[PDB]
Amino acid sequence: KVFGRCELAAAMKRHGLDNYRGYSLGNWVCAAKFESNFNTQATNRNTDGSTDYGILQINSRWWCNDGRTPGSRNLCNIPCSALLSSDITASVNCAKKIVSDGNGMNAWVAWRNRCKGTDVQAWIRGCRL
Ligand code: NA
Numbered sequence: 719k720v721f722g723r724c725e726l727a728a729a730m731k732r733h734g735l736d737n738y739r740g741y742s743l744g745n746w747v748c749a750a751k752f753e754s755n756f757n758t759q760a761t762n763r764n765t766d767g768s769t770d771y772g773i774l775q776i777n778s779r780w781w782c783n784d785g786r787t788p789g790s791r792n793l794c795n796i797p798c799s800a801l802l803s804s805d806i807t808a809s810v811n812c813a814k815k816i817v818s819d820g821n822g823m824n825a826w827v828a829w830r831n832r833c834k835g836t837d838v839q840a841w842i843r844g845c846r847l
Contacts, residue, residue: 772801
């Protein structure tokens, strides 16, 4: 599913990402834009042989099982394919566990490089939220 910006903002807010671990909603919308272009079916292979999945490009080294990442973990206790659904529940639940790590949203390289320090609330402007 390719979300609209306000559509994704509303879904992320409903699922409780607004101000989760102190990150305002626009941070999550910006992260999803630059990680996946708001496409839940996005996948990208990493150099280490792990893969990133879904609207927040969650990685198979630590967070999900894709059955092809040797010596990896599955801390979200999900198949990586769960992160490609039109239903973003599994991606949000897993993003909450990621951002609760001490690195916060710096786990998302696209957030660090294209959202952090910018006016991220621009990503929710115009939306009825
Ligand atoms: Na894994």
